[PDB]
């Protein structure tokens, strides 16, 4: 499609919010390109209201060893997080960059 692939990731991610509270499992799901932020499996449907557009931005990974990514993107590029495991964060990487793989400038 006009973006790459519609995937759709769905599963917890741990993230970074803060230097004191890290780690923090936080339930994240990618739809059409949208990772957005959840507290729960069951709260997918509603969740926090604010989502990552990986796509119009970037999606960050990195760190030289087992899990490794972040999230860049509108008005606020500011996403440090973990994953369950790494092929967790590489599912990630995976499915981000398989939606957005066509924007290589800004999903617009």
């Given at each position: 499609?006009?973006?790459?692939?519609?995937?759709?990731?769905?599963?917890?991610?741990?993230?970074?919010?803060?230097?004191?509270t890290?780690?923090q499992?936080?339930?994240?799901?990618?739809?059409?390109?949208?990772?957005?932020?959840?507290?729960?499996q069951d709260?997918?449907?509603?969740?926090?209201?604010?989502?990552?557009?990986?796509?119009?931005?970037?999606?960050?990974?990195?760190?030289?060893?087992?899990?490794?990514?972040?999230?860049?993107?509108?008005?606020?590029?500011?996403?440090?997080?973990?994953?369950?495991?790494?092929?967790?964060r590489?599912?990630?990487?995976?499915?981000?960059?398989?939606?957005?793989?066509?924007?290589?400038?800004?999903?617009?």
């Amino acid at each position: 499609g006009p973006l790459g692939s519609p995937e759709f990731m769905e599963g917890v991610l741990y993230k970074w919010t803060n230097y004191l509270t890290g780690w923090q499992p936080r339930w994240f799901v990618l739809d059409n390109g949208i990772l957005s932020y959840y507290d729960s499996q069951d709260d997918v449907c509603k969740g926090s209201k604010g989502s990552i557009k990986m796509a119009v931005c970037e999606i960050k990974v990195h760190s030289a060893d087992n899990t490794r990514m972040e999230l860049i993107i509108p008005g606020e590029q500011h996403f440090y997080m973990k994953a369950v495991n790494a092929a967790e964060r590489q599912r990630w990487l995976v499915a981000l960059g398989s939606s957005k793989a066509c924007l290589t400038d800004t999903r617009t």
